[PDB]
Design a protein around this ligand. Sequence first.
Ligand SMILES: *[C@@H]1O[C@H](CO[C@@H]2O[C@@H](C)[C@@H](O)[C@@H](O)[C@@H]2O)[C@@H](O[C@@H]2O[C@H](CO)[C@@H](O[C@@H]3O[C@H](CO[C@H]4O[C@H](CO)[C@@H](O)[C@H](O)[C@@H]4O[C@@H]4O[C@H](CO)[C@@H](O[C@@H]5O[C@H](CO)[C@H](O)[C@H](O)[C@H]5O)[C@H](O)[C@H]4NC(C)=O)[C@@H](O)[C@H](O[C@H]4O[C@H](CO)[C@@H](O)[C@H](O)[C@@H]4O[C@@H]4O[C@H](CO)[C@@H](O)[C@H](O)[C@H]4NC(C)=O)[C@@H]3O)[C@H](O)[C@H]2NC(C)=O)[C@H](O)[C@H]1NC(C)=O
Ligand SMILES: *[C@@H]1O[C@H](CO[C@@H]2O[C@@H](C)[C@@H](O)[C@@H](O)[C@@H]2O)[C@@H](O[C@@H]2O[C@H](CO)[C@@H](O[C@@H]3O[C@H](CO[C@H]4O[C@H](CO)[C@@H](O)[C@H](O)[C@@H]4O[C@@H]4O[C@H](CO)[C@@H](O[C@@H]5O[C@H](CO)[C@H](O)[C@H](O)[C@H]5O)[C@H](O)[C@H]4NC(C)=O)[C@@H](O)[C@H](O[C@H]4O[C@H](CO)[C@@H](O)[C@H](O)[C@@H]4O[C@@H]4O[C@H](CO)[C@@H](O)[C@H](O)[C@H]4NC(C)=O)[C@@H]3O)[C@H](O)[C@H]2NC(C)=O)[C@H](O)[C@H]1NC(C)=O
Lengths: 207, 206
Amino acid sequence: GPSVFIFPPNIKDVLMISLTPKVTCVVVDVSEDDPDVQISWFVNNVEVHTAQTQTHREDYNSTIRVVSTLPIQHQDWMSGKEFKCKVNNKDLPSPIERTISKIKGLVRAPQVYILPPPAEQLSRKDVSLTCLVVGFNPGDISVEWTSNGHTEENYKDTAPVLDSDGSYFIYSKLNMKTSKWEKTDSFSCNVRHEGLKNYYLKKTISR
Amino acid sequence: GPSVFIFPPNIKDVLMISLTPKVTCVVVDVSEDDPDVQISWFVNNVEVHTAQTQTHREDYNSTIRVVSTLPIQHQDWMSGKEFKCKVNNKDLPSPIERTISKIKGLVRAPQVYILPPPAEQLSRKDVSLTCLVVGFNPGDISVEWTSNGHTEENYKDTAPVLDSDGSYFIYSKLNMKTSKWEKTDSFSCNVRHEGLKNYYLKKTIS
Ligand SMILES: *[C@@H]1O[C@H](CO[C@@H]2O[C@@H](C)[C@@H](O)[C@@H](O)[C@@H]2O)[C@@H](O[C@@H]2O[C@H](CO)[C@@H](O[C@@H]3O[C@H](CO[C@H]4O[C@H](CO)[C@@H](O)[C@H](O)[C@@H]4O[C@@H]4O[C@H](CO)[C@@H](O[C@@H]5O[C@H](CO)[C@H](O)[C@H](O)[C@H]5O)[C@H](O)[C@H]4NC(C)=O)[C@@H](O)[C@H](O[C@H]4O[C@H](CO)[C@@H](O)[C@H](O)[C@@H]4O[C@@H]4O[C@H](CO)[C@@H](O)[C@H](O)[C@H]4NC(C)=O)[C@@H]3O)[C@H](O)[C@H]2NC(C)=O)[C@H](O)[C@H]1NC(C)=O
Ligand SMILES: *[C@@H]1O[C@H](CO[C@@H]2O[C@@H](C)[C@@H](O)[C@@H](O)[C@@H]2O)[C@@H](O[C@@H]2O[C@H](CO)[C@@H](O[C@@H]3O[C@H](CO[C@H]4O[C@H](CO)[C@@H](O)[C@H](O)[C@@H]4O[C@@H]4O[C@H](CO)[C@@H](O[C@@H]5O[C@H](CO)[C@H](O)[C@H](O)[C@H]5O)[C@H](O)[C@H]4NC(C)=O)[C@@H](O)[C@H](O[C@H]4O[C@H](CO)[C@@H](O)[C@H](O)[C@@H]4O[C@@H]4O[C@H](CO)[C@@H](O)[C@H](O)[C@H]4NC(C)=O)[C@@H]3O)[C@H](O)[C@H]2NC(C)=O)[C@H](O)[C@H]1NC(C)=O
């Protein structure tokens, strides 16, 4: 039968008032013979009808995939409301329910550091610039890169990792040809985390 | 009913001839009223009786957990033999089978770099020393820390991450007092990966 997964809003959406946070319920392994899936959503056990639901055939493994996206209020996520999807399909004996909420806990702001490329890397044609964000709880965080107020897209973050001291760290790695690294006036590590004043810190490394 | 998960040997065991690599089959959500589970193992579809199997009650969630550990030959893993567990329990309509093997692929050796603690951290009482291992395939790697032949245990690695160029990177973070950093003669990042000459490279910093 079908499996249902529920996913939280993206922390960047949660932490910026101009963006819309969304809870996601994904149904996989739906049969092509029984494609109809009914998804109901609840906020604190009250039914809401604000979700958008898309259905798609996964041609690569002969199943249907349904995705429902519930837009939510920042205040409801932050205050700990429970967001619940309920899924009905012919292949299902009883409806499947999933619920999710922000779990209350310890809050601690990250320290943000930028580490330049290692000397041994500078003779190469490409270099990596590292942002180390350490000491934060909880381990939901957004790290993005810019260059002089221009968006940089060639970077990868690690997952947040539980450190020995009970907090989290994450490393972000921006990749660039060595000539950009010399040519450029500054680079910035843009960190969004609920532990931070104004939910935002920027750290810059200037030529 | 019960569910079964299968796990590969540790990459360090695979890459050191003196260590025994092990395939692990774990059965969870076994009922307390039917604890008996039969696990059989197969290497390329021929049955072996070399595994050690342990059962334990999980008191925190009222279920039985069974762990079968199959010791394997390095060459068997490396040459791509399939290792298979078959699990029987009274709560299974039919036996559950899981199989694993080393997947064949490109091999690329990592570059290893060590980055000193960031300048703004030197003012604090604890510092972070970073090993950046980058440019490797496949994404199975061992990274460990020493100082002067001494084992350092206060470090955490990230999992390997698939990079922009199709290769993997990992970061390893060694935590220590600022004094230790300033007084210690050397720190070494010890990397084990199948792309490396002798499956081993050590980078060292002062
Ligand atoms: C047929 O194919 C489909 C599709 O697969 C795709 O196509 C095929 C052909 C292949 O190419 C394949 O590689 C392709 O992916 C298959 O569908 C897959 O099915 C499996 C289940 O069989 C699903 O596995 C679960 O994955 C969860 C994690 O999923 C995320 O991360 C994975 C890993 O990368 C991604 O692949 C997924 O897409 C998910 O990614 C997330 O997606 C979110 C929703 O979109 C994103 O959030 C949204 O993002 C947007 C922006 O994009 C907005 O911001 C929204 O606001 C936001 O909501 C999110 O960003 C994104 N993240 C990432 C990383 O990109 C696992 O969590 C889950 O594990 C749980 O469940 C298991 C039970 O099955 C259980 O064993 C685990 O232990 C775990 O259980 C949970 O554990 C905790 C305790 O720790 C408990 O609290 C829970 O209750 C507990 N649950 C239970 C009940 O025990 C699964 O591993 C897989 O996700 C799914 N893929 C896709 C793409 O949907 C299908 O299987 C194929 N069928 C056949 C027959 O072969
Ligand atoms: C009752 O409790 C038990 C026990 O849980 C514990 O106690 C409870 C009370 C809680 O406190 C809890 O927090 C505790 O953990 C519960 O048991 C759990 O059940 C879930 C599913 O219900 C299992 O989830 C799967 O996890 C896999 C990953 O497992 C590792 O990682 C987690 C977290 O990091 C660890 O907790 C686990 O222990 C696993 O850790 C690994 O264990 C290995 C073997 O022991 C180690 O390797 C060995 O290492 C030793 C050294 O020690 C030697 O070196 C050996 O040589 C070596 O072999 C290994 O190092 C270690 N790693 C780490 C990081 O520690 C997931 O892979 C898996 O996902 C798959 O399956 C899902 C199906 O359910 C599916 O949805 C997913 O999509 C995914 O599916 C597969 O995807 C792959 C690609 O990855 C595809 O190729 C496949 O096709 C596809 N298959 C399928 C079928 O679709 C699950 O998420 C969980 O592992 C298990 N925990 C334990 C401890 O056993 C139980 O659920 C509870 N019951 C109830 C009702 O509450």
